[PDB]
Amino acid sequence: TMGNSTVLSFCAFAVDAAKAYKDYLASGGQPITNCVKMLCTHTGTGQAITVTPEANMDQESFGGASCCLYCRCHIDHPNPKGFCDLKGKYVQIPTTCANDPVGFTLKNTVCTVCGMWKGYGCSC
Ligand SMILES: CN(C)c1ccnc(N)c1
Numbered sequence: 246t247m248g249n250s251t252v253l254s255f256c257a258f259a260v261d262a263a264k265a266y267k268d269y270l271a272s273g274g275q276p277i278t279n280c281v282k283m284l285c286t287h288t289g290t291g292q293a294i295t296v297t298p299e300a301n302m303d304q305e306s307f308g309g310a311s312c313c314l315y316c317r318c319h320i321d322h323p324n325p326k327g328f329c330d331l332k333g334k335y336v337q338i339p340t341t342c343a344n345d346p347v348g349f350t351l352k353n354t355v356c357t358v359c360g361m362w363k364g365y366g367c368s369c
Pocket residue numbers: 287301302303304305340
């Protein structure tokens with residue numbers, strides 16, 4: 246276990262932070278920990294990114310910024326406006342992927358219709 250500060254530093258100063266973390270995970274690296282887990286009932290809408298925790302029975306809810314590689318690395322978000330989709334919100338992670346919330350949000354996309362994670366919650 247290399248520690249959160251060692252992993253985040255390695256990714257933060259890489260020319261491509263996302264690729265650095267994905268290559269680290271693929272190599273067998275232990276996921277980033279100390280994401281902020283929310284107390285919830287697991288009776289929510291199950292939507293991906295919400296104003297309040299919305300985990301269903303198949304999900305865990307976390308503080309959004311704690312699960313964002315760019316927020317955790319203190320670097321710019323890689324879009325024109327440098328906007329973060331997660332900061333100030335709550336993110337629902339499938340239980341099967343909740344050992345690595347940072348890797349999950351990095352690798353996945355929210356369906357613009359149902360507002361659930363494409364390939365997991367989404368039933369479109
Ligand atoms: C129903 N309960 C207690 C659940 C459901 C999903 N995930 C966790 N961690 C707990």
